[PDB]
Amino acid sequence: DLKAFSKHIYNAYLKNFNMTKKKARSILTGKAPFVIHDIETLWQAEKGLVWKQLVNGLPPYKEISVHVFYRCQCTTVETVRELTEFAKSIPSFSSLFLNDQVTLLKYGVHEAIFAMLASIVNKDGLLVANGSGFVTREFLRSLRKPFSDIIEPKFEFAVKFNALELDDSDLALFIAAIILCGDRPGLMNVPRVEAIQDTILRALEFHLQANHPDAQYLFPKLLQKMADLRQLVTEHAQMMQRIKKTETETSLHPLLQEIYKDM
């Protein structure tokens, strides 16, 4: 029964995401992306590197540390869009009141984004523009503060999370468990959410058995990663709040602006 449930969430993930850990992990290994590590290479990428969201559709250019930020902002907004469509793809989720759905997405989306970030990450950098390019970690560290400080706790996490060696069928269930969380403030029908969450967590355990049989303590380890993700997002909202006051000239997307609102 839970085999059918797991299959459905996997089909909802594959049907909804531009990049599987499978596709990403091949690109970062072999059988090539254009490495962005300085101003010259960013300009080079800006010129002839296939971005889904074009440069003309970005906020008015200000500076380098800000342009990088705006490009990142776009993908976060598009991942919020994939995740909403993935959440709706679960028929149990798309049954709750539209505001209860918005509550789960408002608080769960950033947790999910960071868990999925580990798929396109390695110790030295991350994939960009559907794997067309590869941005270096040192380049991002070389940007001005506060911008150089944003992506660092994400990388620390991503590396640790990648050690668990999860596949796309594990992530579909992991993300589902992240979205459908009863601990979200402003939830109306908490028993119904808590209900669905239980089904997912049951499904996640029995799938981790069939997919990772020799894996010691995987399920409680992922339950801890879920908690760690909650902290990383608390830390993240806090940073973007500082960026909102300090960087008055940088434009924060209202959707993300609303996510960090009462966090």
Ligand SMILES: CC(C)c1nnc(NS(=O)(=O)c2ccc(CCNC(=O)c3sc4cc(F)ccc4c3Cl)cc2)s1
């Ligand atoms: C980068 C630093 C100033 C930040 N600004 N916002 C942050 N948010 S975040 O939570 O850490 C976060 C949120 C979502 C992701 C996934 C998407 N990332 C991308 O697609 C990126 S980064 C980058 C740098 C480039 F030159 C060119 C393109 C490019 C692209 Cl594309 C990563 C990090 S980090």
Ligand SMILES: CCCCCCCCO[C@@H]1O[C@H](CO)[C@@H](O)[C@H](O)[C@H]1O
């Ligand atoms: C508080 C913010 C979190 C809410 C997430 C909203 C983002 C989802 O935006 C989605 O865009 C799609 C196509 O353009 C549509 O088909 C959907 O109806 C829509 O909800």
